[PDB]
Structure 1
Protein backbone atom coordinates (compact mmCIF):
# COMPACT_ATOMS: atom_id res chain seq x y z
CA UNK A 1 0.00 0.00 0.00
CA UNK A 2 0.99 3.72 -0.43
CA UNK A 3 -0.68 5.56 2.49
CA UNK A 4 0.89 8.87 1.46
CA UNK A 5 -0.74 8.78 -1.99
CA UNK A 6 -4.11 7.95 -0.30
CA UNK A 7 -3.52 10.88 2.11
CA UNK A 8 -2.97 13.31 -0.78
CA UNK A 9 -6.16 11.95 -2.41
CA UNK A 10 -8.11 12.69 0.80
CA UNK A 11 -6.63 16.19 1.03
CA UNK A 12 -7.88 16.99 -2.48
CA UNK A 13 -11.32 15.38 -2.22
CA UNK A 14 -12.09 16.81 1.23
CA UNK A 15 -11.62 20.38 -0.12
CA UNK A 16 -14.19 19.74 -2.88
CA UNK A 17 -16.59 18.01 -0.52
CA UNK A 18 -17.21 21.46 0.90
CA UNK A 19 -16.04 24.00 -1.70
CA UNK A 20 -18.71 22.92 -4.18
CA UNK A 21 -21.66 23.55 -1.87
CA UNK A 22 -22.05 27.29 -2.66
CA UNK A 23 -20.85 29.83 -5.15
CA UNK A 24 -17.43 29.40 -6.66
CA UNK A 25 -17.01 25.66 -6.59
CA UNK A 26 -13.19 26.03 -6.24
CA UNK A 27 -13.20 28.19 -3.12
CA UNK A 28 -14.48 27.82 0.44
CA UNK A 29 -16.65 30.68 1.67
CA UNK A 30 -17.21 31.27 5.40
CA UNK A 31 -20.12 28.82 5.58
CA UNK A 32 -18.21 26.07 3.79
CA UNK A 33 -15.01 26.70 5.76
CA UNK A 34 -17.02 26.35 9.04
CA UNK A 35 -18.46 23.00 7.92
CA UNK A 36 -15.05 21.70 6.78
CA UNK A 37 -13.32 22.64 10.06
CA UNK A 38 -16.12 21.33 12.24
CA UNK A 39 -16.67 18.00 10.48
CA UNK A 40 -13.17 17.25 9.22
CA UNK A 41 -10.64 18.97 11.50
CA UNK A 42 -12.44 19.21 14.84
CA UNK A 43 -9.10 19.01 16.71
CA UNK A 44 -7.90 22.30 15.23
CA UNK A 45 -10.40 24.84 16.60
CA UNK A 46 -11.52 22.52 19.40
CA UNK A 47 -14.03 24.59 21.47
CA UNK A 48 -13.46 27.73 19.39
CA UNK A 49 -16.44 27.48 17.02
CA UNK A 50 -17.70 31.04 17.68
CA UNK A 51 -17.88 33.74 14.98
CA UNK A 52 -14.78 35.58 16.31
CA UNK A 53 -12.66 32.45 15.87
CA UNK A 54 -14.01 31.75 12.34
CA UNK A 55 -13.43 35.31 11.18
CA UNK A 56 -9.91 35.23 12.58
CA UNK A 57 -9.27 31.93 10.74
CA UNK A 58 -10.68 33.28 7.48
CA UNK A 59 -8.48 36.37 7.82
CA UNK A 60 -5.38 34.19 8.53
CA UNK A 61 -6.03 31.80 5.59
CA UNK A 62 -7.28 34.26 2.98
CA UNK A 63 -3.85 35.57 1.85
CA UNK A 64 -5.14 37.19 -1.36
CA UNK A 65 -7.98 39.00 0.45
CA UNK A 66 -10.82 37.74 -1.79
CA UNK A 67 -12.97 36.63 1.22
CA UNK A 68 -12.67 32.92 0.41
CA UNK A 69 -10.13 30.12 0.77
CA UNK A 70 -8.87 28.58 -2.46
CA UNK A 71 -7.03 25.28 -2.87
CA UNK A 72 -3.58 26.83 -2.56
CA UNK A 73 -4.53 28.71 0.66
CA UNK A 74 -6.08 25.48 1.99
CA UNK A 75 -2.81 23.57 1.40
CA UNK A 76 -0.86 26.28 3.26
CA UNK A 77 -3.33 25.85 6.14
CA UNK A 78 -3.00 22.02 6.19
CA UNK A 79 0.78 22.39 6.05
CA UNK A 80 0.61 24.64 9.13
CA UNK A 81 -1.46 22.04 10.99
CA UNK A 82 0.98 19.30 9.93
CA UNK A 83 3.93 21.42 11.23
CA UNK A 84 2.17 21.73 14.59
CA UNK A 85 1.42 17.96 14.78
CA UNK A 86 5.03 17.33 13.87
CA UNK A 87 6.20 19.14 17.03
CA UNK A 88 4.39 16.52 19.14
CA UNK A 89 5.44 13.44 17.13
CA UNK A 90 7.30 12.06 20.19
CA UNK A 91 4.41 12.79 22.60
CA UNK A 92 6.37 15.72 24.06
CA UNK A 93 7.97 18.89 22.63
CA UNK A 94 11.41 17.57 21.67
CA UNK A 95 12.93 20.96 20.93
CA UNK A 96 13.55 21.52 24.60
Structure 2
Protein backbone atom coordinates (compact mmCIF):
# COMPACT_ATOMS: atom_id res chain seq x y z
CA UNK A 1 0.00 0.00 0.00
CA UNK A 2 2.70 2.54 1.06
CA UNK A 3 6.15 2.91 2.58
CA UNK A 4 7.39 2.50 6.13
CA UNK A 5 10.92 4.06 6.42
CA UNK A 6 13.51 4.32 3.69
CA UNK A 7 17.27 4.60 2.95
CA UNK A 8 18.72 7.10 0.39
CA UNK A 9 17.69 5.41 -2.87
CA UNK A 10 14.42 4.33 -1.22
CA UNK A 11 13.68 8.05 -0.43
CA UNK A 12 14.56 9.17 -3.96
CA UNK A 13 12.31 6.51 -5.56
CA UNK A 14 9.56 7.63 -3.12
CA UNK A 15 9.81 11.36 -3.99
CA UNK A 16 8.88 10.66 -7.65
CA UNK A 17 6.12 8.20 -6.60
CA UNK A 18 4.54 10.84 -4.32
CA UNK A 19 4.82 13.39 -7.21
CA UNK A 20 3.14 10.80 -9.49
CA UNK A 21 0.41 10.09 -6.90
CA UNK A 22 -0.37 13.71 -5.93
CA UNK A 23 -0.93 14.56 -9.62
CA UNK A 24 -2.51 11.20 -10.56
CA UNK A 25 -5.26 11.71 -7.98
CA UNK A 26 -6.75 14.46 -10.13
CA UNK A 27 -9.47 13.18 -12.45
CA UNK A 28 -10.19 9.54 -11.69
CA UNK A 29 -8.16 7.17 -9.68
CA UNK A 30 -4.84 7.95 -8.00
CA UNK A 31 -3.33 4.55 -8.95
CA UNK A 32 -3.45 5.49 -12.71
CA UNK A 33 -2.36 8.58 -14.65
CA UNK A 34 -5.30 10.11 -16.53
CA UNK A 35 -5.02 12.70 -19.38
CA UNK A 36 -5.54 15.83 -17.43
CA UNK A 37 -3.00 14.71 -14.85
CA UNK A 38 -0.38 13.59 -17.34
CA UNK A 39 -0.54 16.69 -19.54
CA UNK A 40 -0.63 18.77 -16.33
CA UNK A 41 2.52 16.94 -15.08
CA UNK A 42 4.46 17.60 -18.28
CA UNK A 43 3.16 21.17 -18.57
CA UNK A 44 3.77 21.99 -14.88
CA UNK A 45 6.48 19.67 -13.53
CA UNK A 46 8.62 18.47 -16.52
CA UNK A 47 8.53 21.36 -19.04
CA UNK A 48 12.24 22.27 -19.29
CA UNK A 49 13.30 18.60 -19.33
CA UNK A 50 10.50 17.18 -21.47
CA UNK A 51 10.81 19.97 -24.04
CA UNK A 52 7.76 18.61 -25.85
CA UNK A 53 4.93 19.23 -23.44
CA UNK A 54 3.00 20.01 -26.65
CA UNK A 55 2.94 16.59 -28.35
CA UNK A 56 2.46 14.70 -25.05
CA UNK A 57 -0.22 12.74 -26.97
CA UNK A 58 2.52 10.89 -28.93
CA UNK A 59 4.37 10.00 -25.71
CA UNK A 60 0.99 8.97 -24.19
CA UNK A 61 0.28 6.65 -27.14
CA UNK A 62 3.85 5.26 -26.88
CA UNK A 63 3.47 4.80 -23.09
CA UNK A 64 -0.08 3.43 -22.78
CA UNK A 65 0.34 0.65 -25.27
CA UNK A 66 -2.59 -1.50 -24.07
CA UNK A 67 -4.29 1.83 -25.00
CA UNK A 68 -6.87 1.55 -22.19
CA UNK A 69 -5.82 5.21 -21.68
CA UNK A 70 -5.18 4.58 -18.01
CA UNK A 71 -1.46 5.34 -17.92
CA UNK A 72 -0.96 2.39 -15.61
CA UNK A 73 1.25 1.82 -12.53
CA UNK A 74 4.19 0.92 -14.82
CA UNK A 75 3.12 2.06 -18.04
CA UNK A 76 3.53 5.63 -16.70
CA UNK A 77 6.82 4.98 -14.92
CA UNK A 78 8.60 4.73 -18.32
CA UNK A 79 8.32 8.56 -18.54
CA UNK A 80 10.66 9.04 -15.55
CA UNK A 81 12.97 6.70 -17.55
CA UNK A 82 12.84 8.79 -20.63
CA UNK A 83 13.70 11.91 -18.60
CA UNK A 84 16.38 9.85 -16.78
CA UNK A 85 18.11 8.93 -20.05
CA UNK A 86 17.24 12.34 -21.72
CA UNK A 87 19.77 14.15 -19.49
CA UNK A 88 22.40 11.89 -21.16
CA UNK A 89 20.46 11.24 -24.40
CA UNK A 90 19.54 14.50 -26.24
CA UNK A 91 17.42 12.74 -28.96
CA UNK A 92 19.37 9.74 -30.11
CA UNK A 93 16.96 6.81 -29.53
CA UNK A 94 15.17 6.07 -32.82
CA UNK A 95 14.32 2.31 -32.64
CA UNK A 96 11.51 0.59 -34.62
CA UNK A 97 10.53 -3.02 -33.81
CA UNK A 98 7.35 -5.17 -33.76
2:24 aligns with 19
Q: CA deviation digits over 1:69-93, x for unaligned, max 9? A: 12211222212221222347xxxxx
* Alignment RMSD: 2.0
- Residue 86 of structure 1 aligns to a residue whose secondary structure is coil
- Kindly indicate which of the two structures has a greater share of residues assigned to helix: 1
What is the CA–CA distance in structure 2 between the aligned matches of 1:72 and 1:21, rounded to whole Å? 18
Residues 17 and 60 of structure 1: CA distance in aligned 2, closer, same or farther (over 3 Å)? same
Unaligned runs of 5+ in 1: 89-96
Q: Does 1:61 align with 2:66?
A: no
TM-score (norm 2): 0.71
What is the CA–CA distance in structure 2 between the aligned matches of 1:45 and 1:75, rounded to whole Å? 14
Residues 54 and 29 of structure 1: CA distance in aligned 2, closer, same or farther (over 3 Å)? same
TM-score (norm 1): 0.72
- Residue 64 of structure 1 aligns to a residue whose secondary structure is coil
- Kindly indicate which of the two structures has a greater share of residues assigned to strand: 1
